Amino acid sequence: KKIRTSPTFRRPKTLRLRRQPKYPRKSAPRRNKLDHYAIIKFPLTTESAMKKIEDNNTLVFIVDVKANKHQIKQAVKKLYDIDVAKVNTLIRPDGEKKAYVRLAPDYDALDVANKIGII
Amino acid sequence: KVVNPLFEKRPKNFGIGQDIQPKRDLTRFVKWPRYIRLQRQRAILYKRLKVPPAINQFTQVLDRQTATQLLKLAHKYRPETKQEKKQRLLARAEKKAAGKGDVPTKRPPVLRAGVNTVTTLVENKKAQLVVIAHDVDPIELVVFLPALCRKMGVPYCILKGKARLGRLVHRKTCTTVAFTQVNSEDKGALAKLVEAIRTNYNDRYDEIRRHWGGNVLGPKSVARIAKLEKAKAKELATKLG
Amino acid sequence: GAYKYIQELWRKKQSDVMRFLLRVRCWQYRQLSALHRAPRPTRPDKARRLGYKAKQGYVIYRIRVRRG
Amino acid sequence: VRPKVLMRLSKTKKHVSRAYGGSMCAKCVRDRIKRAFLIEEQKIVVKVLKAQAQSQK
Amino acid sequence: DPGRGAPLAKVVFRDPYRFKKRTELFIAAEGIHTGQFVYCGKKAQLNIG
RNA sequence: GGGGGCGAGCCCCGAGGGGCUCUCGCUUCUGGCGCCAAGCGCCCGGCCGCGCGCCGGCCGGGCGCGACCCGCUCCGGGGACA
């Protein structure tokens, strides 16, 4: 009481199990070497960068090259407790990433620059 | 009324150019895989080619009633089992030094399983009945052995299935099973089976060895040969008779 | 034992039974791939004489090489 | 318009309220309607003549 | 067809086993027009195309 | 292989019809459409009333015919030769 409907013979869908390993291949998971401190190296004290901070409500940072804009945003928000309007990235011809962090207009840029130390 | 005239018959014409053909039985025309087509047309080659009698003697198989009676007799003499070995060792280990047991006493008769043991105790003429599975996949293991049983005078029979021959022992496959020793309550049934097997295999081994077998054409060509023979009979049988 | 009977049975290759067996096995092995795992030895006496012990771990392949 | 703008457009800007609308012009639609009807009516006529041939012979 | 002196004809059949319009590439005979019913098989009548 | 008949013929014929070879698996005035079954038969579950429930009404499912059966090469063309 079973007939071949189709003239082709396709391979039957057999049951396959999942990875239930008896021992883990590595003893510990790898620690996060892309932390909030290690992802932001330093800000710039360029006069052009300070004009950018004083005029356009931003902060200029030098970032490791393996970073996302979301990573830089959550990194600034985690380190200095300040909200971010947007993160705007480029890569210099020296290997480093440059991040213009446009801040929210409820917090000042010159005050948080005085907090982080640059003037 | 319980009937409704809104129920149109609307039959379907399953003809050429008419309505579409249904999903009918199509097992005749499946593109089967290579191993399926190989194991089918291998048996087709066994049907076509002139099989020599040393291989073709295994199509002669002992029948259903005598096979079930032989299995009923072998079930009385099936060997022991895994952990029944352990019970049999532990019982004699407790019998050794608890109640002055020296144990030379008695072992029950069992069957044999390998072709080596079967050929040795047929050459020793210690066998009484040798069961051979017909469906061993290398046939070279058992070709000589029916002839060897006929030479040594030991009755040999051939049964369907190395699977059900190896279900007598607690294993998967088995090719030869020898009956060495039987009890007095089963010796009469053993002699009846020996007579019924010897009047089928040993007494007409000349007809078995001369029984060539093969050249069985496929039905598509057998029907064509039969059509040509009926055409020749229609052309010249009523011209004479 | 049966291994000596199987030994001279594989020696007598010119007889009709062994010619039929070599024809059927040659067809069956030609209709397969060039290299494939066999689960059991087709010629167990020769396999044992060369060193195949039927236990876990000894594997056999069957393989086609062109002639000439 | 470019065919991915059709993903942006509304439903009534992509077809017309007619059977086979937005995929076939109305002249070929009405010719297809009357063609279906006339082939069906000639099949009815051939079936009636076949039934009369069955009733006679 | 490029590289061919003969014109080809798209001929659409209905597949008698699955609901699908099968198209074919025939070589149209001299006199074959579009909208023509090309028959094919053993019981086909003897006319052009 | 025979069930099916508008059928083409043979034999017997009691003029109902049975066996035998063929026609087919039923489409040619036209740039239309055609799938995921209709109908019948046999069963099953839940609710209500007769209560002897394979009884009656509602809702939900299964199987077979419809779509014949048996087979050992998927069909053909070569083939002991290329």
Swiss-Prot record, chain A:
Signal peptide (from-to): none
Residue ranges of the region described as Beta-like import receptor binding (BIB) domain: 1-37
Residues with PTM Phosphoserine: S6
N6-acetyllysine PTM positions: K33
Post-translational modification as stated in the protein's UniProt record: N-terminus is methylated by METTL11A/NTM1. Citrullinated by PADI4.
Record key words, sorted: Acetylation, Citrullination, Cytoplasm, Isopeptide bond, Methylation, Nucleus, Phosphoprotein, Ribonucleoprotein, Ribosomal protein, RNA-binding, rRNA-binding, Ubl conjugation
Amino acid composition bias (Basic residues), ranges on this chain: 1-30
Modified-residue entries (Phosphothreonine), positions: T8
GO cellular component: cytosolic ribosome; nucleus; ribosomal subunit
Keyword Acetylation tagged: yes
Keyword Transmembrane: no
Main location: cytoplasm
GO molecular function, one term: rRNA binding
Subcellular location per the Swiss-Prot or TrEMBL entry: Cytoplasm; Nucleus
Function (record text): Component of the large ribosomal subunit. The ribosome is a large ribonucleoprotein complex responsible for the synthesis of proteins in the cell. Binds a specific region on the 26S rRNA. May promote p53/TP53 degradation possibly through the stimulation of MDM2-mediated TP53 polyubiquitination.
Domain topic, free-text comment: The N-terminal beta-like import receptor binding (BIB) domain mediates interaction with IPO5, IPO7, KPNB1 and TNPO1.
Entry similarity comment: Belongs to the universal ribosomal protein uL23 family.
Subunit comment: Component of the large ribosomal subunit. Interacts with LYAR and GNL2. Interacts with MDM2; this interaction may promote MDM2-mediated p53/TP53 polyubiquitination. Directly interacts (via BIB domain) with IPO5, IPO7, KPNB1 and TNPO1; these interactions are involved in RPL23A nuclear import for the assembly of ribosomal subunits. Interacts with IPO8.
Listed name of the protein: Large ribosomal subunit protein uL23
Species of origin: Oryctolagus cuniculus (Rabbit)
Full protein segment contained here: 38 to 156 of 156
UniProtKB/Swiss-Prot annotation, chain B:
Gene Ontology cellular component list: cytoplasm; ribonucleoprotein complex; ribosome
N6-acetyllysine PTM positions: K9, K72, K192
Keyword Lipid metabolism: no
Stretch forming the signal peptide: none
Compartment annotation: Cytoplasm
Keywords in alphabetical order: Acetylation, Cytoplasm, Isopeptide bond, Ribonucleoprotein, Ribosomal protein, Ubl conjugation
Keyword Nuclease recorded: no
Main location: cytoplasm
Single GO term (MF): RNA binding
Position(s), cross-link Glycyl lysine isopeptide (Lys-Gly) (interchain with G-Cter in SUMO2): K23, K72, K100, K220
Family: Belongs to the eukaryotic ribosomal protein eL8 family.
SUBUNIT field: Component of the large ribosomal subunit. Interacts with CRY1. Interacts with DICER1, AGO2, TARBP2, MOV10 and EIF6; they form a large RNA-induced silencing complex (RISC).
Functional description taken from the UniProt entry: Component of the large ribosomal subunit. The ribosome is a large ribonucleoprotein complex responsible for the synthesis of proteins in the cell.
Protein name: Large ribosomal subunit protein eL8
Native species: Oryctolagus cuniculus (Rabbit)
High-level lineage: Eukaryota, Metazoa, Chordata, Craniata, Vertebrata
Gene this chain is encoded by: RPL7A
Residues of the full protein shown: 79 to 319 of 319
From Swiss-Prot, chain C:
N-myristoyl glycine lipid sites: G1
Positions of transmembrane segments: none
Localization in the cell: Cytoplasm
Stretches of the chain forming a coiled coil according to its record: none
List of residues that carry Phosphoserine: S33
Family: Belongs to the eukaryotic ribosomal protein eL15 family.
Subunit structure: Component of the large ribosomal subunit. Interacts with IFIT1 (via TPR repeats 1-4).
Role this protein plays: Component of the large ribosomal subunit. The ribosome is a large ribonucleoprotein complex responsible for the synthesis of proteins in the cell.
Record's protein name: Large ribosomal subunit protein eL15
Organism the protein comes from: Oryctolagus cuniculus
Section of the entire sequence shown: 2 to 69 of 204
From Swiss-Prot, chain E:
Modification after translation: The modification is impaired by hypoxia.
Cellular localization per UniProt: Cytoplasm
Annotated function: Component of the large ribosomal subunit. The ribosome is a large ribonucleoprotein complex responsible for the synthesis of proteins in the cell.
Family to which the UniProt record says this protein belongs: Belongs to the universal ribosomal protein uL2 family.
Subunit structure, interactors included: Component of the large ribosomal subunit. Interacts with CRY1.
Identification of the protein by name: Large ribosomal subunit protein uL2
Organism: Oryctolagus cuniculus (Rabbit)
Upper classification of the organism: Eukaryota, Metazoa, Chordata, Craniata, Vertebrata
Gene symbol of the encoding locus: RPL8
